[PDB]
Each structure stands twice: as C-alpha cells, then as structure tokens.
Amino acid sequence: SMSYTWTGALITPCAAEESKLPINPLSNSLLRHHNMVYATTSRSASLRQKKVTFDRLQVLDDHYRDVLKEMKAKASTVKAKLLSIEEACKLTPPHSAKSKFGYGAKDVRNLSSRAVNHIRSVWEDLLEDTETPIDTTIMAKSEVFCVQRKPARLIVFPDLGVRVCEKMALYDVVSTLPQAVMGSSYGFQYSPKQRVEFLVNTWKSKKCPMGFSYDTRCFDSTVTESDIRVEESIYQCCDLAPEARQAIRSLTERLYIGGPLTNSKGQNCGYRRCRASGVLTTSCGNTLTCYLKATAACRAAKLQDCTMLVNGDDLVVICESAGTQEDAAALRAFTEAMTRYSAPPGDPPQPEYDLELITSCSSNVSVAHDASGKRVYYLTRDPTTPLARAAWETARHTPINSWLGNIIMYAPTLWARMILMTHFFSILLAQEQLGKALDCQIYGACYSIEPLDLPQIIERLHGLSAFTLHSYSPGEINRVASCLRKLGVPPLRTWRHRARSVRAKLLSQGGRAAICGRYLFNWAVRTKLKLTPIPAASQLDLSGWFVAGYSGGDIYHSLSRAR
Ligand SMILES: *c1nc2ccccc2cc1Cn1c(C(=O)O)c(-c2ccc[nH]c2=O)c2cc(C)c(F)cc21
Numbered sequence: 001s002m003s004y005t006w007t008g009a010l011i012t013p014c015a016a017e018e019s020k021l022p023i024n025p026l027s028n029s030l031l032r033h034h035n036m037v038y039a040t041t042s043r044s045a046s047l048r049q050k051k052v053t054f055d056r057l058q059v060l061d062d063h064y065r066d067v068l069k070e071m072k073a074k075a076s077t078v079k080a081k082l083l084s085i086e087e088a089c090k091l092t093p094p095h096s097a098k099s100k101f102g103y104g105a106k107d108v109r110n111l112s113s114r115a116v117n118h119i120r121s122v123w124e125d126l127l128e129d130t131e132t133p134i135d136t137t138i139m140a141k142s143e144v145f146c147v148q149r150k151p152a153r154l155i156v157f158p159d160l161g162v163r164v165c166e167k168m169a170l171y172d173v174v175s176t177l178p179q180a181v182m183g184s185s186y187g188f189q190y191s192p193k194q195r196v197e198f199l200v201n202t203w204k205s206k207k208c209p210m211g212f213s214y215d216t217r218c219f220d221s222t223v224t225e226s227d228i229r230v231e232e233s234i235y236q237c238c239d240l241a242p243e244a245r246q247a248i249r250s251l252t253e254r255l256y257i258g259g260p261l262t263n264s265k266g267q268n269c270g271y272r273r274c275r276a277s278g279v280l281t282t283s284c285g286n287t288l289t290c291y292l293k294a295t296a297a298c299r300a301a302k303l304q305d306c307t308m309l310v311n312g313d314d315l316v317v318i319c320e321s322a323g324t325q326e327d328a329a330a331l332r333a334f335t336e337a338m339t340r341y342s343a344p345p346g347d348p349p350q351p352e353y354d355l356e357l358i359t360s361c362s363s364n365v366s367v368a369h370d371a372s373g374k375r376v377y378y379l380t381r382d383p384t385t386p387l388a389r390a391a392w393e394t395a396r397h398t399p400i401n402s403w404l405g406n407i408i409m410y411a412p413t414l415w416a417r418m419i420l421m422t423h424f425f426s427i428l429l430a431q432e433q434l435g436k437a438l439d440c441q442i443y444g445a446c447y448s449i450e451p452l453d454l455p456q457i458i459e460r461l462h463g464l465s466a467f468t469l470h471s472y473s474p475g476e477i478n479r480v481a482s483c484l485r486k487l488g489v490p491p492l493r494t495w496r497h498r499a500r501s502v503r504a505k506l507l508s509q510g511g512r513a514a515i516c517g518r519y520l521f522n523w524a525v526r527t528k529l530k531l532t533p534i535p536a537a538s539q540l541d542l543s544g545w546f547v548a549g550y551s552g553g554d555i556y557h558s559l560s561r562a563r
Contacts, residue, residue, distance in 0.1 A: 091167050144388050170251070209355075251281075283553060378469070414472045418496065435512070442557075
C-alpha cells in the first residue's frame with residue numbers, strides 16, 4: 001500500500017516561520033557565516049511529501065518468523081503497569097501542544113477538571129470503540145542545519161487527550177519491553193560512556209572484526225501495516241491490565257497503523273498507512289522493527305557472530321569477518337534481505353575494518369588521553385549541526401536547547417568543551433542566568449536542567465576524565481578546525497582566551513559557579529586545580545535518563561511540583 005495519499009490541501013504553518021539565522025551580536029560571536037545557517041519550514045513540505053510517498057512491497061520469510069518468535073518469547077516475561085491519569089499527566093511537557101478540546105499542557109499538569117474529564121472521556125472511547133480512525137495533525141518540522149538544502153521533515157501527532165491516554169496504556173511497556181526483548185543490543189539503556197564501552201568491547205571481542213552502519217531510507221515510510229500489527233503482537237505478550245490490553249488494541253488499529261491527516265487550518269490533508277513520528281510507540285516500535293528485520297537479514301546473509309546496536313532506525317552491526325570478498329557479498333545479501341522486508345537502504349552499506357571509521361547514532365569512537373596520559377575512548381561527531389543550532393539558540397529563544405543536551409552528551413569532546421561551554425557560560429554569567437533551569441532533550445525525553453549542575457552531571461555520565469582529556473586525535477582536531485573555517489567560527493585560540501576570562505569570573509563567584517570554573521575550564525589553564533569526585537555526583541537521581549528512547553513521544557522526565 002501507499003505510505004501516504006494526499007487530497008491536495010497544503011501542509012500549513014500555524015504562525016510566521018523563520019528560515020534565516022538572525023544577524024545578532026551574540027550569535028555572531030560564535031559563528032560569522034550566518035547565511036550558511038537555515039531552518040526548515042512548511043515552504044519545502046511538498047518536496048518532503050514526494051520523497052516519503054511510495055508503495056511498499058514486503059515479503060516475509062522463515063528467518064523473519066523465527067526471529068519474531070524469539071522476540072515474543074522474551075516479551076512474554078514482561079509485566080506492564082497501567083499508569084493512572086495523574087501519573088500520565090505528570091509525564092506531559094509543560095509546552096506540549098494544547099488540545100483542541102479547550103485546555104493545554106499546563107491544565108493537564110495541574111490536573112484541571114476540564115483536562116482530567118476530557119482525558120477520561122478519551123480513555124473510555126478507546127475502550128469502547130475499536131475502529132474509528134483517530135485524527136492527527138501533520139506539520140512541517142522546524143530544524144536548523146548548515147548548507148551542504150534539506151526539505152522539512154513532517155511530524156504527525158494526535159490530540160493532547162489521546163497522548164495522555166497513550167502514556168496510561170503504554171508508557172511502562174515502551175520503557176521496559178525493549179531491553180527485555182533486545183538485551184544488550186538496545187541502544188537506549190546506555191549512557192554515552194556505556195555506549196562507547198559496549199562498542200569498544202564488542203569490536204575487540206571479535207577474532208577479526210568487520211562492522212557496518214545500515215541507513216534505511218525514510219524509515220517511518222517503510223513501516224507497513226503488518227509491521228505495526230507485528231509490533232502490537234510483541235506488546236500483547238506482556239501481562240497487562242484488561243483496559244491496557246483493549247487500549248493497545250484500539251490504539252493500534254485507530255492510530256498506530258494509520259489514519260487521516262489534518263493540517264493546521266483543519267483541512268483534510270491525506271491519509272497515512274505508515275509510522276507516525278509523533279506517537280508514544282514510535283521509538284520503541286522503530287527499534288523493535290529495525291532489530292527484527294536486521295536480525296533476520298543477518299541470518300539470510302550468513303553474517304557470522306553478529307552483535308547489533310539499535311536506536312530507533314539507527315543500526316550498527318559488528319561481526320566476525322569471513323574475508324574481504326566474502327564480507328562484501330554478505331553485506332549485499334543483508335541489503336537484499338532488508339529490502340525484501342521493506343527496509344531498503346539510503347546510502348549502500350560498506351564493510352569497515354576500523355571501529356573509528358563507523359558512524360552510528362551520528363557519532364564515532366575517538367581516542368584522547370587523560371591527565372596520566374592513558375587512553376580514553378569517547379564518542380564524538382562532526383560539530384557542524386551542533387554549532388549551527390547553538391548559534392540559532394543564541395539569537396532566538398527556543399523550546400529545546402540543543403546546546404545544553406550537546407554539552408551533556410558530548411562533554412568529553414574538544415568542541416563541546418572549548419566552544420559550547422565557553423560560549424554559553426560567558427553569556428549566561430553576564431546575564432545572571434547560570435542557575436536558571438533550561439529545557440533540553442536526552443534520548444527524546446525532556447529535562448529541565450540548571451547549567452550550574454553540569455559538573456556533577458558530566459562526572460556521572462562520563463567520569464572525571466571528561467575534565468582532563470587532551471592529546472585529541474589528529475583526525476578529530478582536523479574535523480573541528482575545518483568546521484570552524486567553514487562556518488566562520490573564531491579559531492580555538494580565541495576560545496581559549498574567552499574560556500580563561502569566564503573561568504576567572506566563575507571562580508570569583510564561589511559556590512556552584514566556582515565548581516564550574518574548576519572542573520569545566522581546567523583545560524584552559526596550565527596551573528591545574530585539583531579535581532576530586534564532586535559530592536553532588538553520587539547523590540544525582542539519574543533514574544530514567546538511560547532506560548529507553550522517547551523521540552516524538554511527548555515525554556517529560558523532570559519532577560512534578562506537589563499541589
Ligand atoms: C542516536 N541515533 C538515533 C537515530 C534515530 C532515532 C533515534 C536515535 C537515537 C540516538 C541516541 N542518541 C541521542 C538522541 O538524541 O537520542 C543523543 C543525543 C545527542 C544530543 C542531545 N541529546 C541526545 O539524546 C546521543 C548522543 C550520543 C553520544 C550517542 F551515542 C547517542 C545519542
């Protein structure tokens with residue numbers, strides 16, 4: 001069937017859309033080539049619509065059926081809880097899209113009578129009605145990139161009342177089932193340090209390793225009705241409350257498999273028969289579907305001793321090499337099997353014999369040295385998109401601060417330490433906002449974090465070595481330097497000067513600011529301060545940070561205030 005059908009009504013914006021980076025002194029201090037930075041808008045939605053619309057042909061075989069039964073046997077060990085309306089309300093982000101039914105995210109969080117009554121009515125409707133398609137809104141996503149343009153991605157999501165119901169029926173399932181089924185292959189259970197440990201150990205565990213990333217083109221569009229019912233068959237193996245079983249059955253047929261698309265103006269836009277990006281099951285469903293297809297395709301291809309690592313549609317496989325020619329042929333056999341399963345490739349996969357050459361989750365393993373000179377592996381990435389987005393977030397107030405999430409996840413990197421920490425600490429200190437909580441996203445869930453808490457967060461995530469790395473790889477330094485020239489970012493010497501300046505000011509303030517000066521900016525001085533374990537690090541409640549993925553799932557993981 002066709003992934004989408006369209007009526008001809010346009011994908012519309014709900015307000016004026018900004019496509020150009022503003023010319024602003026604070027953003028200009030970070031990046032001078034402002035014309036290279038853009039944001040996608042509804043103006044390119046028709047180009048995306050063409051790319052995402054196609055017929056799917058899917059053929060399943062014994063390897064697919066065998067792997068599915070293995071997955072269901074593991075899912076059969078799970079007992080999932082139904083969340084109360086109150087618990088599900090608390091998981092709603094404060095800025096989540098308002099309902100069309102007279103209330104918004106703040107009313108949900110406050111347990112307002114109108115919000116709670118409506119959510120209850122939506123829940124009862126899921127229990128009683130197993131067929132009526134649930135409405136969804138289709139919007140063009142606003143995302144920032146550097147030139148060389150990408151058309152906007154399309155986001156599809158149901159009303160706020162339905163989103164709260166999805167949490168009640170499935171939040172516990174999507175949080176616990178993926179690890180029970182996929183074990184060590186489930187990417188979202190790892191912090192960045194644990195992910196690099198798993199990749200390095202897996203690589204080294206092979207006699208003669210070969211690895212590859214597999215890029216599925218327009219993955220959400222390749223997900224078929226059959227895939228979404230297979231995914232439901234795995235969820236149905238859980239022990240579930242009867243109302244949760246019915247809600248999952250009703251959501252599967254009424255929402256997850258497909259449904260009508262409405263634009264921001266209320267016009268009938270078309271019909272979806274593939275994965276919606278903005279529902280609670282997208283991350284878990286994509287991961288399960290990708291894992292299932294790839295595990296079966298590994299068997300079809302006769303790849304030896306595979307270890308996969310999956311996060312949504314992002315897949316990396318590390319295996320035992322059978323020789324150069326044999327590996328090349330086996331990878332072609334894998335791609336053919338994936339294509340039969342409706343997971344055709346974007347970039348054709350290539351065998352890699354060096355762990356550092358593999359990009360998975362847009363990141364690569366690199367090496368630096370700690371204060372003792374010992375090798376430390378860590379994950380890095382090309383900093384172009386992080387810097388372009390940091391420039392946009394400096395010029396405009398954005399709902400999510402990607403710069404803050406990038407400092408958290410990429411804290412050991414040369415670019416996050418020299419550029420991102422320096423830039424934002426300089427601005428926030430001048431604005432007396434170092435202690436002001438900001439929203440960021442980790443594995444798709446929203447968190448409210450004070451920048452002054454970064455040292456203990458980084459210590460917990462990455463270890464104290466994240467504050468002592470030096471002697472970065474020539475390849476990594478070259479990639480950063482080239483990026484700075486391309487974007488017009490001041491050279492590293494300028495960043496060191498700015499860092500020494502903000503470090504002095506932070507130390508002068510005492511308290512949490514002085515801890516930031518000591519740990520975050522020790523790289524900027526010769527006269528190193530002593531770095532000891534931070535008392536706050538061991539008390540941090542990081543429960544729920546690296547458990548599961550929630551991209552598009554409308555999840556907020558920070559604490560709810562008592563009433
Ligand atoms: C990686 N790749 C993905 C592809 C498709 C769907 C999901 C998915 C998830 C990842 C995991 N991952 C994320 C992320 O956004 O979930 C991040 C990340 C970066 C910056 C801010 N917040 C984040 O969560 C990752 C960082 C690193 C170093 C990873 F190895 C994996 C990450």
